[PDB]
């Protein structure tokens, strides 16, 4: 580890700096270093880890989509042959994306999930596990596609089970997990009815609990509820 010689606290400080500078690759490397110190992560630290990698893989996903669309057009009738370059470059980006996903999944497996006992942390990490298997599924075309999809499903399902037992229906983590698992159903698992049912039930159960919340907690929960509504509007 290139970050092995840097203090944990210094890695966290520099991750925050990197965020301010929009240097997300650096942020991710700093937070990977911090995880590899072996201590559990605080709430704030968990969010720095997730922000960093979300931004890195998000850019990779956007690039992969551009290249995939070009490649698809090249394989239409009437399209002039341009050689192997589009496929090669799409494959390069894809391999880099898969590497980032594997890195995140490796951190979760060694050893973030196994040491996470509180519902808030365990659900957070299992949501991440679902998310990064979902990103792998987006690009999967082979013998392992079914198994990748099932790995995403399994992680999301364990997170859902804990969240329903241990967290209120307005909890932001719970809401964001449901949002993403609903997208998994719609976009990955070919289950739009399940996606819609999940989004609606989640929204409605949150609405019924808003009365318990402070002004600040209300703002947090309603923001995510709006994303559920936005998806429902897209899908219906």
């Amino acid at each position: 580890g290139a970050m092995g010689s840097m203090e944990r606290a210094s890695l966290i400080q520099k991750a925050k700096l990197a965020e301010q500078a929009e240097r997300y690759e650096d942020m991710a490397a700093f937070m990977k270093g911090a995880v590899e110190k072996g201590e559990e992560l605080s709430c704030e630290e968990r969010n720095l880890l997730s922000v960093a990698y979300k931004n890195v893989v998000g850019g990779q996903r956007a690039a992969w989509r551009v290249l995939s669309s070009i490649e698809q057009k090249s394989n239409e009738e009437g399209s002039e042959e341009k050689g192997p370059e589009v496929r090669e470059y799409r494959e390069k980006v894809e391999t880099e994306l898969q590497g980032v996903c594997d890195t995140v999944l490796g951190l979760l497996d060694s050893h973030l999930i196994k040491e996470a006992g509180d519902a808030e942390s365990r659900v957070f990490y299992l949501k991440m596990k679902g998310d990064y298997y979902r990103y792998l599924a987006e690009v999967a075309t082979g013998d392992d596609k079914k198994r990748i999809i099932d790995s995403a499903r399994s992680a999301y399902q364990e997170a859902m089970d804990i969240s329903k037992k241990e967290m209120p229906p307005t909890n932001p983590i719970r809401l964001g997990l449901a949002l993403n698992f609903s997208v998994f159903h719609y976009e990955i698992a070919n289950s739009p009815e399940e996606a819609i049912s999940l989004a609606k039930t989640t929204f409605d159960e949150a609405m019924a609990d808003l009365h318990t919340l402070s002004e600040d907690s209300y703002k947090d929960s309603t923001l995510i509820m709006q994303l559920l509504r936005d998806n429902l509007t897209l899908w219906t």
Binding site: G176, L179, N180, V183, E187, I224, L227, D230, N231
Partner: peptide, 5 residues
Amino acid sequence: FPATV
């Protein structure tokens, strides 16, 4: 694309 967080 749909919203995720």
